[PDB]
Write a protein that binds this ligand. Structure first.
Ligand SMILES: Nc1nc2c(ncn2[C@@H]2O[C@H](COP(=O)(O)OP(=O)(O)O)[C@@H](O)[C@H]2O)c(=O)[nH]1
Length: 271
């Protein structure tokens, strides 16, 4: 419980505790504390919320404007390239993404570009999966998938990718190839490139490599039902500078929640 209304120095000491306990981490926490003193506002809970919300929402034209007139997570286009290292919940996350968007009325397709599990999810969810024979070129596959999505009038295509980091072929170059192939099928695409990260392993070095290669537009952080306190989302967005799109909160297909930075911040600071 943080004493809003107590002495300036009392609020900050219990804020540091709350934030540190939440796994927001020393670097971000110190930043908030610095930011908060500076800003000589009487309403420090509202001031704290603004700084925490602020650092989760890194998305020029909006800077000039000062608000977003359109503000409900939805891909900006039809194709979402999903990237990440193996074992983070990439396949499962795609399955949950399909479920979530098909529950909203979208026609969703999957592309099995990790050349098993995805095909089976597609059957279960009644979602078509573009898939190929044992080791097919994932890039040629992604191109066929975008053409199939266009031709059959589908709204969303989720492209699964390899996540093995020290193989004979460079993972990042394979990704750029998939991304180039998608753009030959539809040059506006992929409008989303989404990194999947483990909460528990809330550790970002590799994550930056993903961004340099293919240009992230968002992150999905899985396993927020785990021992990692939810405050780890803060250093994730500070470091990556793309918003959290969804949070994974269990192993079943409905355990995916669109991220709400305002609800998150309110819950972070709750008594
Ligand atoms: N508890 C929990 N488990 C998850 C979550 N997301 C993924 N998993 C589990 O993580 C494991 C790895 O998932 P998988 O889809 O095979 O990961 P991939 O190798 O990254 O494609 C599976 O056992 C999933 O059940 C989550 O949000 N919560």
């Amino acid at each position: 419980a943080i004493p809003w209304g107590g002495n300036l120095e009392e609020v900050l000491e219990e804020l540091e505790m709350a934030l540190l306990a939440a796994d927001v981490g020393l670097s971000a926490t110190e930043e908030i504390l610095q930011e908060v003193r500076a800003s000589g506002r009487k309403d420090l809970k509202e001031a704290v919320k603004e700084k925490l919300v602020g650092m989760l929402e890194p998305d020029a034209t909006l800077r000039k404007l000062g608000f977003n007139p359109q503000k409900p997570v939805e891909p900006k286009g039809r194709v979402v390239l999903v990237v990440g290292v193996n074992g983070v919940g990439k396949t499962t996350t795609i399955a949950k993404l399909g479920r979530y968007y098909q529950n909203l009325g979208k026609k969703v397709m999957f592309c099995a570009g990790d050349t098993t599990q995805l095909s089976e999810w597609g059957k279960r969810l009644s979602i078509p999966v573009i898939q190929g024979p044992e080791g097919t070129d994932p890039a040629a596959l992604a191109y066929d998938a975008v053409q199939a999505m266009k031709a059959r009038g589908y709204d969303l295509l989720f492209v699964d990718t390899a996540g093995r980091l020290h193989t004979k072929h460079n993972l990042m170059e394979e990704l750029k190839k998939v991304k180039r192939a998608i753009a030959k099928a539809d040059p506006e695409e992929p409008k989303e490139v989404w990194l999947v990260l483990d909460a528990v392993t809330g550790q970002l070095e590799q994550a930056k490599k993903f961004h340099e290669a293919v240009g992230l537009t968002g992150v999905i952080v899985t396993k927020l039902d785990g021992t990692a306190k939810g405050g780890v989302l803060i250093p994730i967005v500070r470091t990556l500078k793309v918003p959290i799109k969804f949070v994974g909160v269990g192993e079943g297909p409905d355990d995916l929640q669109p991220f709400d930075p305002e609800a998150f911040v309110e819950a972070l600071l709750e008594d």
